[PDB]
């Protein structure tokens, strides 16, 4: 509802999108975001997807990329939707536990300074380490900025972590549907379609599957 | 105000600021059956408890049901589990649904009587000190206290939201424990595997190919 | 001074002339009420309408047939789409009522709180639902053309125009099924052989219409 | 005291020369709503530019590939480019380009800028009148060409209905109906091929297959209302 870029340059926006929150275009057409105790939540949903699928696309990628150059690793050219049945030094349940107390733990210091920000920045153990106050939750800064980042021009910032994102979410779901469908690997899908992009979009796969 | 039929009159008993403040007014009643004011505040808690019950039992049917499906599971049809679990079972079924009256018959008689009339378990003496917890919230149907281990209540903001969410999400499985009885009467099969039926052949697998739609 | 379906007559008293297509026929007194008078309205341009498309629907089917295209006639196309396609009939039958149950009980509810249908509860739509008068719902889906808003005079001579042809149209489709139910062949094979022959191709020499040939 | 398409008549009170090409003509009233006319002003454009270069493309196509048949034209192509992916370079090339044609209909004043290459932006025209980089070196009046390009563009929308039920009752494109035309005047008519009389229908047969094979999956042809022909 102002001169906000717009996913759709020329309609209206609902004007709870104004540009306070990261990265915005006033891209909700079902309009989800209306009670704003929604949209802090779905923010810091997105931020977490985002994340999570960041390094998702970048441990999808490279693993294919340096299993198609070829290195030599013990896990060199399986399927990222195939490395839950490859064997490593301890059976998967142990991994999965080992996950899901760590993140047990983690978790929840994130959604205690959700609930309450600036009430997590102090170590259990070592309580002379602190996250720097004035921090808002899904950006701790800190630690979690040991390279000196976010000290100025930190909109374009998040708007840049945002964009990338929602790319990598796209990505990560365009992995599931395109290894769902031809069943290869998502390097692969990229290397017959610089084969002869003519002869395989996806309506001629889709035609040659129905 | 967000009605089932968008063109009816409302009944009035639906209308009222006793009513328009409940969970999940969408205006439905067209054979008049909460006129009575208390008659509406015990079919409220039977809305409630016949959702609750019902979305226990369908996420007990659908999560094992498609967890069956696409394997690392083995639960069986939903009227096979109690043919088996029988056998593989320490008790037979008539001691065990005597032991199920009795625990369940000493948590309904306390529903009742709290409902019949509220805080009536919070009297201090009844318990050994659990009883403190236990007057429920200012509205009866919601208890909380023990019944809240996450602490979703003390908002007293998105409190309707939740209210709506748990009533809608109910009777949505209410009826689907309709369509679970109802789908296995009429075909046999189970209730994922019909779901396969329509999605396999949407426009010819479906409840007019059946004899139950007969003109 | 208006005409009248039967001149002499005068009309009746709850019958003066600002309906569409008002001729002063009503000699059992059925819209008497007007509230009942409002919902016969809605139901003589409904009637009015499906007879106006499905009198369509048989003459262009049947224009279809006898020239030498491979359509069928009407009373003979409820079979060959549901066995030269494969459909199930049980089905469309069911999806016919449940689309049309949907657009009627709007309709229906239209006619019982007539500003009702239109405060957004559908999927979006406000004024689009509005309805402008009865059986004359209006808007941007029903006339997109917008021929009921620009000369308001104009918009009565096609109010007035859409009642005959719509009239004229449900006499019609009650005369293909009279035309099925004596001969037993095409409407339009029935309209060639009134004109190989005009006399003795006509309805008082088919047997039926008279049983004292 | 504008010309009209029927000179004695009275043109209606939403015609009002206002338009260019506004001749009085509209029978039916449906430029009465003044929203619904703006549409069917960028409609009739639309349809009319659409028509100037299909019967351009159809009559050039036809004078320098004679073998060729226009009718045939999109089953006969061999493309290197695949079946399916010039229609997805088309599906998303078009809905680009149309989808910007209908947010300046809906709001003109919002869209006129290059999005990605900012210091270019439309000068502020008028709706179904784009010009600036559209419409460079124009010769002369631009509303005596706004009459004009109507003009032709009207006469082009009849030409390509001409073309199609041309070619769907000879089989020719439109240079040898033409030469049919030129060859026999009084013989290849359609009064000449059809006639209906009340007790007979003589209409003329179809010279377009009801299906082509094209790779696999055939398309169905209608021959467009064969049997409601004459
Ligand atoms: C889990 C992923 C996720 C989540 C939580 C959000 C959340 C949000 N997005 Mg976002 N977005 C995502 C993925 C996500 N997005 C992806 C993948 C893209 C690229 C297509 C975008 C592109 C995008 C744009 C361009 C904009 C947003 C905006 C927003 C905000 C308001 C819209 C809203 O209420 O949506 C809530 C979202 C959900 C409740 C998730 C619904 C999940 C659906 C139903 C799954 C099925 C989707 C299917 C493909 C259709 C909100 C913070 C707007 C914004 O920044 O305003 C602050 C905005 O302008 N998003
Ligand atoms: C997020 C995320 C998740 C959940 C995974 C999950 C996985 N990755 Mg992976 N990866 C990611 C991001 C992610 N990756 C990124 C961003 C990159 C870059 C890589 C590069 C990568 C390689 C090169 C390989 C994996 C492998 C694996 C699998 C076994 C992990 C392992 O060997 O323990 C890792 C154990 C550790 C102790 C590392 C944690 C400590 C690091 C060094 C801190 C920094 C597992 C499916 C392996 C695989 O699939 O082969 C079968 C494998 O060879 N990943
Ligand atoms: C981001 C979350 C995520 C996603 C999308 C998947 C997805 C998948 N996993 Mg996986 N997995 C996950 C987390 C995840 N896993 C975690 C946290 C663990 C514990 C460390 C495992 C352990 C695991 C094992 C042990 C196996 C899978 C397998 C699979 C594949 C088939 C299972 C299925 O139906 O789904 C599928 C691609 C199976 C596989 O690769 O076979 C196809 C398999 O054997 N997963
Ligand atoms: C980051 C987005 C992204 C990208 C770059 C690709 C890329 C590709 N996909 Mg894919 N896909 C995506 C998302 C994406 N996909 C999603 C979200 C789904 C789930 C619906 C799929 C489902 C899918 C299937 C089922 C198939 C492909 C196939 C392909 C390949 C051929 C292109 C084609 O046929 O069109 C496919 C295009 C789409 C499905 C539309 C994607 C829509 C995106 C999000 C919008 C465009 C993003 C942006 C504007 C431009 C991207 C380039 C940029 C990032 C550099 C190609 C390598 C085919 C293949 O492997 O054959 C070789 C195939 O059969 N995709
Ligand atoms: C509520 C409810 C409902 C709807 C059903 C429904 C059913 N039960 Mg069941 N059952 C219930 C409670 C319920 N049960 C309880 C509380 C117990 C514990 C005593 C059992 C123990 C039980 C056994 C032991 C068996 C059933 C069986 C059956 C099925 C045959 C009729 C049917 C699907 C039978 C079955 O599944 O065999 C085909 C069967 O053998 N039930
Ligand atoms: C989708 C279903 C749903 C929803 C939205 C709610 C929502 C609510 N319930 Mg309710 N409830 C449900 C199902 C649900 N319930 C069922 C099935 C039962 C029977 C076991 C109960 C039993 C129950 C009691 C006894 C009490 C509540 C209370 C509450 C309120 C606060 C707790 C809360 O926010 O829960 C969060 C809602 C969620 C859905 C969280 C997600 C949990 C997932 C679905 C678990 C998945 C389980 C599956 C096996 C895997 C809120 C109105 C308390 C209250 O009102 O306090 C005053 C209270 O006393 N409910
Ligand atoms: C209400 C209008 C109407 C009328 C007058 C008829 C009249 C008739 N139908 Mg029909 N039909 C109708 C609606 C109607 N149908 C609808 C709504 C459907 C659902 C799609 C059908 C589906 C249908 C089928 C499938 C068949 C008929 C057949 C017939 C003929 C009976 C022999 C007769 C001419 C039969 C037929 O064609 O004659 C053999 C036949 O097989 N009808
Ligand atoms: C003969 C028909 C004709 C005429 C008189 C006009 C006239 C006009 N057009 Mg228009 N236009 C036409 C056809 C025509 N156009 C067609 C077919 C298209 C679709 C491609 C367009 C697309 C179009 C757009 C998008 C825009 C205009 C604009 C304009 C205005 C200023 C431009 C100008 O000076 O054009 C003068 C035109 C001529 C002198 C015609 C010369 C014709 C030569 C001889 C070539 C014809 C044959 C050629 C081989 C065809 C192939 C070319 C092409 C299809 C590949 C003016 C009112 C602009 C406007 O409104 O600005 C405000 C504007 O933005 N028109
Ligand atoms: C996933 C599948 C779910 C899809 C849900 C679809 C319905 C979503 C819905 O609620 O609608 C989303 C909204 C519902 O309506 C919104 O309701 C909100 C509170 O209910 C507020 O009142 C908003 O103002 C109102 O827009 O629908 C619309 O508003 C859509 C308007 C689109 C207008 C397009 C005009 C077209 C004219 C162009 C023709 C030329
Ligand atoms: C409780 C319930 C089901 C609970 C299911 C359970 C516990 C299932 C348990 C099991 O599955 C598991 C877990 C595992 C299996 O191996 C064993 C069993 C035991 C099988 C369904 C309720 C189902 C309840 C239903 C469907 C109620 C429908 C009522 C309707 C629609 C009434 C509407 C109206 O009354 C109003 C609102 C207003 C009036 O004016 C108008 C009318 C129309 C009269």
């Known amino acids: 509802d102002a001169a906000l870029p717009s996913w759709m340059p020329g309609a209206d926006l609902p004007g709870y999108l104004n540009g306070t929150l990261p990265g915005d275009f006033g891209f909700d057409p079902l309009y989800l975001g209306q009670d704003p105790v929604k949209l802090k939540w779905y923010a810091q949903a997105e931020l977490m997807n985002a994340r999570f699928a960041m390094l998702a696309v970048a441990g999808i990628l490279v693993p294919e990329l340096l299993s198609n150059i070829g290195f030599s690793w013990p896990g060199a050219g399986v399927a990222w939707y195939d490395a839950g049945k490859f064997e490593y030094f301890a059976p998967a349940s142990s991994l999965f536990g080992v996950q899901m107390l760590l993140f047990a733990w983690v978790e929840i210091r994130r959604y205690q300074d959700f609930v309450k920000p600036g009430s997590a920045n102090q170590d259990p153990i070592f309580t002379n380490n602190k996250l720097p106050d004035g921090n808002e939750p899904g950006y701790p800064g800190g630690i979690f900025d040991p390279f000196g980042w976010s000290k100025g021009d930190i909109k374009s910032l998040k708007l840049k972590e945002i964009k990338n994102g929602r790319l990598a979410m796209l990505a990560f779901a365009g992995f599931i549907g395109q290894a769902y469908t031809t069943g290869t690997t998502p390097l692969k899908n990229l290397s017959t379609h610089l084969a002869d992009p003519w002869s395989t979009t996806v309506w001629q796969n889709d035609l040659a599957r129905l | 105000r967000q009605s089932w039929l968008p063109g009816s009159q409302i009944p009035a008993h639906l209308d009222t600021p006793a009513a328009q403040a409940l969970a999940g007014n969408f205006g439905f009643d067209p054979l008049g059956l909460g006129k009575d004011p208390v008659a509406l505040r015990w079919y409220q808690q039977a809305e409630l408890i016949h959702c609750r019950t019902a979305m226990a039992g369908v996420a007990g049917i659908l999560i094992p049901g498609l967890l069956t499906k696409a394997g690392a599971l083995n639960v069986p049809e939903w009227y096979d589990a109690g043919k088996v679990a029988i056998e593989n079972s320490f008790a037979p079924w008539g001691s065990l649904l005597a032991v199920q009256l009795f625990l369940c018959g000493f948590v309904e008689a306390k529903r009742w009587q709290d409902i019949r009339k509220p805080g009536s378990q919070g009297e201090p003496g009844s318990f050994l000190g659990f009883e403190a917890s236990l007057k429920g919230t200012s509205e009866l149907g919601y208890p909380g206290g023990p019944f809240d281990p996450l602490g979703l209540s003390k908002e007293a903001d998105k409190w309707a939201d939740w209210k709506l969410k748990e009533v809608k999400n109910g009777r949505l499985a209410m009826l689907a424990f309709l369509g679970f009885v109802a789908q296995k009467y009429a075909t046999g099969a189970g209730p994922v595997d019909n779901l396969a039926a329509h999605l396999k052949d949407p426009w010819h697998v479906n409840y007019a190919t059946n004899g139950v739609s007969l003109p | 001074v208006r005409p009248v379906w039967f001149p002499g007559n005068p009309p009746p008293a709850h019958l003066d002339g600002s309906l569409a297509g008002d001729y002063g026929f009503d000699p059992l007194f059925l819209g008497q009420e007007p509230q009942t008078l409002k919902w016969y309205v809605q139901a003589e341009l409904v009637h009015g309408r499906f007879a106006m498309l499905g009198a369509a629907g048989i003459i262009l089917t049947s224009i279809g047939a006898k020239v030498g295209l491979g359509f069928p006639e009407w009373y003979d196309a409820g079979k060959v789409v549901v066995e030269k396609n494969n459909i199930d009939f049980p089905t469309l039958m069911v999806i016919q009522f449940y689309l049309m149950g949907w657009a009627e009980t709007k309709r229906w509810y239209d006619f019982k709180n007539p500003g009702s249908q239109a405060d957004g509860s559908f999927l979006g739509f406000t004024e689009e639902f509005k309805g402008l008068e009865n059986g004359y719902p209006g808007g941007r889906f029903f006339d997109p053309m917008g021929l009921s808003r620009g000369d308001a005079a104009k918009y009565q001579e096609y109010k007035q125009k859409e009642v005959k042809n719509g009239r004229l149209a449900m006499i019609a489709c009650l005369g293909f099924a009279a035309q099925y139910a004596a001969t037993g062949k095409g409407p339009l094979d029935n309209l060639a052989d009134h004109l190989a022959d005009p006399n003795h191709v006509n309805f008082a020499t088919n047997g039926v219409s008279i049983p004292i040939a | ?230």
Not at chain 4, 170 to 183: D, R, W
């Open chain 4, 1 to 230: 005291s504008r010309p009209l398409w029927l000179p004695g008549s009275t043109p209606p009170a939403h015609l009002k020369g206002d338009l260019p090409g506004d001749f009085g003509f509209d029978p039916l009233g449906l430029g009465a709503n003044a929203e619904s006319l703006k549409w069917f002003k960028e409609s009739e454009l639309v349809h009319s530019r659409w028509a100037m270069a299909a019967v351009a493309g159809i009559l050039v196509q036809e004078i320098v590939r004679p073998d060729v048949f226009w009718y045939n034209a999109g089953k006969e192509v061999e493309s290197p480019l695949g079946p399916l992916g010039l229609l997805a370079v088309e599906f998303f090339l078009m809905h680009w380009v149309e989808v910007r044609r209908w947010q300046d209909l809906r709001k003109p004043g919002s869209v006129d800028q290059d999005p990605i290459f900012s210091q270019y932006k439309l000068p502020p025209h008028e709706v179904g009148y784009p010009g600036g980089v559209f419409a460079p070196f124009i010769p002369g009046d631009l509303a005596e060409l706004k009459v004009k390009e109507i003009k032709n563009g009207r006469l082009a929308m009849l030409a390509f209905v001409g073309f199609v039920m041309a070619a769907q009752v000879t089989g020719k494109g439109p240079i040898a109906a033409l030469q049919e035309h030129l060859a026999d005047p009084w013989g290849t008519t359609i009064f000449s091929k059809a006639a209906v009389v009340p007790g007979q229908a003589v209409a003329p047969p179809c010279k377009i297959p009801a299906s082509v094979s094209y790779k696999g999956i055939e398309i169905p042809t209608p021959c467009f209302l064969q049997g409601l022909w004459p």
